[PDB]
Structure 1
Amino acid sequence: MVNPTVFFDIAVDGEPLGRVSFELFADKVPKTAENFRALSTGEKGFGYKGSCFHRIIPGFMCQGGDFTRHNGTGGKSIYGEKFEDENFILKHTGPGILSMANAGPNTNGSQFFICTAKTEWLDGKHVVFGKVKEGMNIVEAMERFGSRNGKTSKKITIADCGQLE
């Protein structure tokens, strides 16, 4: 151990954009970090590779991780279907925060978002579990394919993903 590092290679209608890497806070939210880690390697036989960022809102966040329905209504965890909010120790303090999307309390599956700003109104509502390490420039590039309601102007996909260490 040590907190693990995962990467995504991002593409735009298939054209490579670049690599984003994340530190996952297994020291504070081990169950949540492990879900995202395993979905990033695909070790359970499903996961993030090939999925899209379906909702990108400039100045707010980039949301993805629905690998089952590919529209924001789907996705599942490595623990069945959904799991509890683990804790809310960490806060949405600024750009680069990685946090769990949900449909209300205790409905974590696979969907997640990457903040591009401080979003303190999500504190206590979404479980923060990591941060961007490398590639914030790529997140900023992704953000530019979003819109105010979150519809993307091109398809923003996870071409590849996995664990770095």
Structure 2
Amino acid sequence: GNPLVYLDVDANGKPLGRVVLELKADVVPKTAENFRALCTGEKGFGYKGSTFHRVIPSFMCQAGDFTNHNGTGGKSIYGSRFPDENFTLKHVGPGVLSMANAGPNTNGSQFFICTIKTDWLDGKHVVFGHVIEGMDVVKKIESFGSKSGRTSKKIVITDCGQLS
């Protein structure tokens, strides 16, 4: 089966709630596993204590740079970067979970949760899951963003892990 993972998110030290994500290990097992292990922190590093560095209303919420905290970093459980597994899953609408990148075959740890259908990203960013519950929390994160992507509050992943 597919893993269920979670992100507990805060804004300036105040809890916003929980985002539960299904990771599509049935379609992209390598990409799903990388995200799963970064949530648990079982490799000695991961998302706990990192931020949503770029939040653009009516687009997406981007996070996962746990090394540089500015959008230039992060790393995968495999190494600094890994190939694009496939582009089978599409950016069909809000709640889609997909890999950020610096062009072809540059997946690391940065990811984004869509707040609209981002179909122009199909075949360019690897989709590997979706929001199961807590889309209201994603909308709360979205409200602290701007068209520049800059946030009005520091959005932190205070805790994360695996549910099943």
Which TM-score bucket, shorter chain as reference? over 0.9
Match of 1:26 in 2: 25
Aligned residues: 164
Code of the aligned partner of 2:130: K
1:15 aligns with 2:17: no
2:136 equivalent in structure 1: 137
Which residue in 1 is equivalent to 2:147?
148
Query: Amino acid of the residue matched to residue 121 of structure 1?
Result: W
Deviations 1:21-73 (CA, angstroms, capped at 9, x unpaired): 00000000000000000000000000000000000000000000000001100
- In 1, the alpha carbon distance for the partners of 2:114 and 2:21 equals 13
Determine the C-alpha separation between the residues in 2 that align with 1:71 and 1:13.
17
> What CA distance in whole angstroms lies between the structure 2 residues aligned with 1:14 and 1:126?
31
Overall identity of the aligned pairs, in %: 75
Q: Which runs of 5+ in 2 are unaligned?
A: none
Runs ≥4 residues deviating over 3 A: none
Please show how residues 104-119 of structure 1 align to structure 2 within 5 Å.
Answer: 104-119=103-118
Q: Please give the alpha-carbon distance, in whole angstroms, between the structure 2 residues aligned to 1:40 and 1:127.
A: 18
> Which one-letter code corresponds to 2:146 in the other structure?
S
Structure-2 residue corresponding to 1:79? 78
Q: Which amino acid aligns with 2:14?
A: E
Alpha-carbon distance between aligned partners in 2 of 1:80 and 1:20, rounded to the nearest angstrom = 26
One-letter amino acid of the structure 1 residue matched with residue 97 of structure 2:
L
Residue type matched to 1:90 in 2? L
1:50 is matched with which residue?
Answer: 49
> Equivalents in 2 of 1:45, 1:151: separation in Å?
29
Query: How far apart, in 1, do the equivalents of 2:13 and 2:99 lie?
Result: 25
Q: In the alignment, residue 131 of structure 1 is paired with which amino acid?
A: H
1:36-47, aligned counterparts within 5 Å? 36-47=35-46
How far off is 1:14 after superposition? 1.0
Cα distance between partner residues in 2 of 1:8 and 1:120: 25
Deviation of 1:149 after TM superposition, in Å, equals 1.3
Q: Distance in 2 between matches of 1:110 and 1:145?
A: 22
TM-score (norm 2): 0.99
CA RMSD of aligned residues (A): 0.4
CA apart distance, 1:151 = 0.5
**Equivalent residue, structure 1, for 2:158:** 159
Q: SS of the counterpart of 1:141? A: helix
Q: Tell me the secondary structure at the aligned position of residue 69 of structure 1.
A: coil
Are 1:89 and 2:66 counterparts?
no
Shift of 1:105: 0.4
Counterpart amino acid of residue 132 in structure 2: K
Q: Give how far 1:7 is off.
A: 0.3
